[PDB]
């Protein structure tokens, strides 16, 4: 269970996908 926070240092592959 990951936090949904889409930013330049965050990677969406595996969390917000």
Angle made by CA atoms 10, 2, 9, in degrees to the nearest 5: 5
Which residue in the block uniquely carries the two structure tokens 């990951």? 2
Task: Label each residue of the chain as H, E or C.
Answer: CCCCCCCCCCCCCCCCC
Round the CA-based radius of gyration of the chain to a whole number and report it: 7
Contact 1, 14 (CB under 8 A): no
- The most distant pair of C-alpha atoms in the chain lies apart, rounded to whole Å, by 20
Structure tokens at 1: 């269970």
Cα separation of 4 and 11, whole Å? 11
Contact 2, 12 (CB under 8 A): no
Region class of 3: left (phi > 0), else alpha (psi between -120 and 50), else beta: beta
Contact 17, 11 (CB under 8 A): no
- What's the start-to-end Cα distance of the chain, in Å? 13
């Amino acid at each position: 269970a990951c936090k949904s926070t889409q930013d330049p240092m965050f990677t969406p592959k595996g969390c917000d996908n």
